[PDB]
Design a protein around this nucleic acid. Structure first.
Ligand SMILES: Cc1cn([C@H]2C[C@H](O)[C@@H](COP(=O)(O)OP(=O)(O)OP(=O)(O)O)O2)c(=O)[nH]c1=O
Ligand SMILES: [Mg+2]
Length: 388
DNA sequence: AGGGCCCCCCC
DNA sequence: GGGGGAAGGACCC
């Protein structure tokens, strides 16, 4: 039995912007990214704003919406890693998911605490925060005790995140990642919830569509629907065999175990970043077939700010999509090597890599289905994977 | 909007 | 029978 905690920060970007300009922590705030309010503080989430596009929307219903541009991600990424590192201090095995979510495997830490505790104060163990579904605690239930201890470590992490970094967020404590992630969102404004085993089904059936289950995105959702599957119970009771003969024995078994709140996936130690991507606009809304720029911009600070961590990349990749349907149907990249020696220097002559990156990108692009809708249709994305 | 595991060669 | 490198998927924050 594992004790996993899922940490999810409150409207992350807004938080990082509010901490920068205090005169914002009192009025409806939204962070804008090319006519798309990616997020906003709760002091505006009540005003109908739901991370929706159209900058004008909230604007009207909030003159002093004071929107801030969040295109440059530097500040967010830095705070993101400070959160992960603080968490890593509590326990080494920490997995990142986006810039503001972290899973932490607390199993060993919980045990170390229990063993350290007396055979009398064990009945004094209490919970920190909410108990999902207001379920009654049984102090003689070893799993209840361990999960309550987990709730205590979660409260400590949130407290330390606030005292040391000035950030608030929610936490969810459960026996696996799926359940921890689902329960962390029960009481969302800066609070935490722990899930005792007997309430697992209640939590899973509280969802209104199999697509709300972590591990089932836009794709599988559609495939399950066309198969007569919309509710969680529909998946739990669907014939395994047929499911297996539709998504494979791999996906079928996994997808179906999730419907029961079963997930054995391990919390992965993310450690340092395995790549340094950095997309750009003027190609999703309107572009001029730029090039010398789609290489100096995309790869701007992406260079002078890669020596900080002191690590060398060995591969470049350009991702490209197109004007499609359904949802965001558009995945078409292009990767290549990155010569060492002079290219991967360590002195002043770093500009020399500018040109080389040009020709490659400007070759892997002209080979991007240049015949049917490959131009001007939302794209632009470069990567720096493979580092050692 | 910005960021981050899973066919072909040539041996 | 056996590796390494591309180009793209696929899935998520
Ligand atoms: C999902 C998603 C998140 N993000 C960014 C915005 C968020 O600040 C950050 C974290 O993802 P989220 O957690 O889903 O966004 P949030 O923290 O603002 O919302 P909540 O308080 O309800 O948990 O990453 C994107 O840029 N694009 C996306 O498609
Ligand atoms: Mg969040």
């Amino acid at each position: 039995s594992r004790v996993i905690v899922h940490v999810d920060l409150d409207c992350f970007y807004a938080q990082v912007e509010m901490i920068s300009n205090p005169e914002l922590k009192d009025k409806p705030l939204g962070v804008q990214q090319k006519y798309l309010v990616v997020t906003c503080n709760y002091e505006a989430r009540k005003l109908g704003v739901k991370k929706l596009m159209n900058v004008r929307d909230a604007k009207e219903k909030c003159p002093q919406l004071v929107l801030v541009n969040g295109e440059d991600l530097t500040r967010y990424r830095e705070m993101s890693y400070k959160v992960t590192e603080l968490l890593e201090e509590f326990s080494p095995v920490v997995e990142r998911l986006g810039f503001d979510e972290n899973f932490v495997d607390l199993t060993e830490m919980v045990e170390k605490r229990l063993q350290q505790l007396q055979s009398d104060e064990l009945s004094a163990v209490t919970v920190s925060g909410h108990v999902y579904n207001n379920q009654s605690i049984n102090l003689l239930d070893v799993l209840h005790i361990r999960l309550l201890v987990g709730s205590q470590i979660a409260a400590e992490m949130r407290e330390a995140m606030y005292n040391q970094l000035g950030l608030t967020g929610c936490a969810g404590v459960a026996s696996n990642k799926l359940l921890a992630k689902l329960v962390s969102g029960v009481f969302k404004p800066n609070q935490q919830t722990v899930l005792l085993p007997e309430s697992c089904q209640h939590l899973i059936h509280s969802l209104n569509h199999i697509k709300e289950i972590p591990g089932i995105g836009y794709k599988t959702a559609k495939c399950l629907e066309a198969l007569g599957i919309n509710s969680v119970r529909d998946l739990q009771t669907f014939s395994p065999k047929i499911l297996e003969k539709e998504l494979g024995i791999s996906v079928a078994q996994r997808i179906q175990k999730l419907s029961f709140g079963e997930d054995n996936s391990p919390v992965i130690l993310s450690g340092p970043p395995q790549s340094f991507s950095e997309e750009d606009s003027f190609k999703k809304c309107s572009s001029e077939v730029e090039a010398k720029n789609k290489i100096e911009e995309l790869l701007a600070s992406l260079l002078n700010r890669v020596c900080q961590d002191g690590r060398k990349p060995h591969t470049v990749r350009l991702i490209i999509r197109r004007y499609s349907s359904e949802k965001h149907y558009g995945r078409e990249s292009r990767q290549c090597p990155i010569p060492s020696h002079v290219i991967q220097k360590l002195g002043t002559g770093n500009y020399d890599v500018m040109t080389p990156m040009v020709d490659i990108l400007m070759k892997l692009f002209r080979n991007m289905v240049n015949v049917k809708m490959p131009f001007h249709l939302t794209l632009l994305s470069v990567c720096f994977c493979n580092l050692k």
